[PDB]
Design a protein around this motif. Structure first.
Motif, PDB file in Angstrom:
ATOM      1  N   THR A  96       1.170  -1.253  -0.184  1.00 55.35           N
ATOM      2  CA  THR A  96       0.170   0.188   0.151  1.00 55.35           C
ATOM      3  C   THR A  96       0.822   1.016   0.139  1.00 55.35           C
ATOM      4  OG1 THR A  96      -1.699  -1.149   0.605  1.00 55.35           O
ATOM      5  CG2 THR A  96      -1.614   0.801   1.050  1.00 55.35           C
ATOM      6  N   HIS A  97       1.996   1.184   1.080  1.00 57.00           N
ATOM      7  CA  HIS A  97       2.400   2.689   1.003  1.00 57.00           C
ATOM      8  C   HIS A  97       3.459   2.857  -0.480  1.00 57.00           C
ATOM      9  CE1 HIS A  97       6.172   0.021   2.344  1.00 57.00           C
ATOM     10  NE2 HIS A  97       6.834   1.117   2.016  1.00 57.00           N
ATOM     11  N   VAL A  98       3.710   2.300  -1.458  1.00 58.47           N
ATOM     12  CA  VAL A  98       4.084   2.369  -2.674  1.00 58.47           C
ATOM     13  C   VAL A  98       3.290   2.524  -3.443  1.00 58.47           C
ATOM     14  CG1 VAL A  98       5.781   0.688  -2.544  1.00 58.47           C
ATOM     15  CG2 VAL A  98       4.763   0.152  -4.365  1.00 58.47           C
ATOM     16  N   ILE A 149       4.499  -1.208  12.414  1.00 58.55           N
ATOM     17  CA  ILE A 149       5.693  -1.006  11.014  1.00 58.55           C
ATOM     18  C   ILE A 149       5.324   0.328  11.268  1.00 58.55           C
ATOM     19  CG2 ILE A 149       7.197  -1.562   9.787  1.00 58.55           C
ATOM     20  CD1 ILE A 149       6.408  -4.032   9.702  1.00 58.55           C
ATOM     21  N   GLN A 150       6.431   0.822  11.917  1.00 57.38           N
ATOM     22  CA  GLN A 150       6.714   3.020  11.253  1.00 57.38           C
ATOM     23  C   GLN A 150       4.614   3.224  12.098  1.00 57.38           C
ATOM     24  OE1 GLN A 150       9.135   2.891   7.835  1.00 57.38           O
ATOM     25  NE2 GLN A 150       7.522   4.448   8.360  1.00 57.38           N
ATOM     26  N   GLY A 151       4.412   2.672  12.773  1.00 58.20           N
ATOM     27  CA  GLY A 151       3.316   3.313  13.337  1.00 58.20           C
ATOM     28  C   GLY A 151       1.762   2.524  11.926  1.00 58.20           C
ATOM     29  N   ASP A 184      12.699  -1.426  -3.470  1.00 60.45           N
ATOM     30  CA  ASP A 184      12.491  -2.561  -3.654  1.00 60.45           C
ATOM     31  C   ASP A 184      10.684  -3.532  -2.514  1.00 60.45           C
ATOM     32  OD1 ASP A 184      14.631  -3.134  -4.688  1.00 60.45           O
ATOM     33  OD2 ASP A 184      16.050  -3.775  -2.908  1.00 60.45           O
ATOM     34  N   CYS A 185      10.523  -2.230  -2.355  1.00 58.90           N
ATOM     35  CA  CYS A 185       8.886  -2.568  -1.957  1.00 58.90           C
ATOM     36  C   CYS A 185       7.831  -2.694  -2.927  1.00 58.90           C
ATOM     37  CB  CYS A 185       8.718  -1.498  -1.052  1.00 58.90           C
ATOM     38  SG  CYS A 185       9.498  -1.669   1.326  1.00 58.90           S
ATOM     39  N   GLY A 186       7.031  -3.917  -2.648  1.00 56.58           N
ATOM     40  CA  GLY A 186       5.984  -4.600  -4.005  1.00 56.58           C
ATOM     41  C   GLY A 186       6.882  -5.362  -4.452  1.00 56.58           C
TER      42      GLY A 186
END
Ligand SMILES: *[C@@H](O)[C@@H]1CCC(=O)NCCn2cc(nn2)C[C@H](NC(=O)OCc2ccccc2)C(=O)N[C@@H](CC2CCCCC2)C(=O)N1
Length: 173
Positions: free
Chosen positions: A30-32, A110-112, A138-140
Motif C-alpha cells: 500500500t505505501h508505494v 511498523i512505523q505506526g 524494492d517495496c512491492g
C-alpha cells in the motif's frame, strides 16, 4: 528458478513494484501506491475494484490488462518454514531474487502502520553478498514459492531491518 514469465509479472509501480497475479489482478504494497491519481495503467478508477488492508493492495481491473498471463494462485502467506524468493527487479531490468525462510504470519505495527504480514529471515547461504530488500524502491516485490510445477505468490515486500536480515511481506487477509 523463477521462470521468465513469472518475472514478466513484476512491474514498476509508484515508488516500488507490483505484480500481475492474472490478466486482471495486480498486487502491491500500500505505501508505494500513488495517491490523488485518476487512473492506474491508463484505466479510470471507476473501472478498478480496489481491496487493500494491512499494507496489502489488490487491484482488479474490469478489462484484461495482461492477457499474456495465466492466472496463478495468490495465498495469504505460506506455511512456516517455506523458502520464498522475493522477485526484486532494479531499474536496469536486472533480476535479483532474494531467498528468505518464512516465519509467523501476524498483525504487527511498523512505523505506526498496521501491517498484516509474515516475517522471514534472509538466507545468508542462498544469496550473493552485496542491498536486496533494504532500499525504498524494492517495496512491492512479490514473495513467491514453487509448489509442484506451479508457482504461488503469497505476499509483497513491505519492511526489513536495517541490515535486511529480517523481512516482512504484507499478506492478503
Ligand atoms: C520499502 O519501502 C522498504 C523496504 C525495507 C527497507 O528498505 N529496509 C532498510 C531500511 N530500513 C527501514 C526501516 N529500518 N531500516 C524501518 C522499517 N523496518 C523495521 O521496522 O524493521 C524492524 C522490524 C520490526 C518488526 C518486525 C520486522 C522488522 C521498514 O522497513 N519500514 C518500511 C516502510 C513502512 C511504511 C509504512 C507501512 C509499513 C512499512 C520500509 O522502509 N520498506
Amino acid at each position: 528458478h523463477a521462470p521468465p514469465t513469472l518475472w514478466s509479472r513484476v512491474t514498476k509501480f509508484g515508488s516500488g513494484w507490483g505484480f500481475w497475479v492474472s490478466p486482471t489482478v495486480f498486487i502491491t504494497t500500500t505505501h508505494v501506491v500513488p495517491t490523488g491519481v485518476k487512473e492506474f495503467f491508463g484505466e479510470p478508477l471507476s473501472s478498478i475494484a480496489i481491496h487493500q488492508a494491512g499494507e496489502f493492495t489488490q487491484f482488479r481491473f474490469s478489462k484484461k490488462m495482461r492477457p499474456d498471463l495465466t492466472g496463478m494462485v495468490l495465498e495469504e502467506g505460506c506455511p512456516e518454514g517455506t523458502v520464498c524468493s522475493v522477485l526484486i527487479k532494479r531499474d536496469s531490468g536486472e533480476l535479483l531474487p532474494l531467498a528468505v525462510r518464512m516465519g509467523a504470519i501476524a498483525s504487527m505495527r511498523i512505523q505506526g502502520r498496521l501491517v498484516h504480514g509474515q516475517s522471514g529471515m534472509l538466507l545468508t547461504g542462498a544469496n550473493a553478498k552485496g542491498d536486496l530488500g533494504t532500499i525504498p524502491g524494492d517495496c512491492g516485490a512479490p514473495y513467491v514459492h514453487k509448489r509442484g510445477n506451479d508457482w504461488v505468490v503469497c505476499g509483497v515486500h513491505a519492511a526489513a531491518t536495517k541490515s535486511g536480515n529480517t523481512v516482512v511481506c504484507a499478506v492478503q487477509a
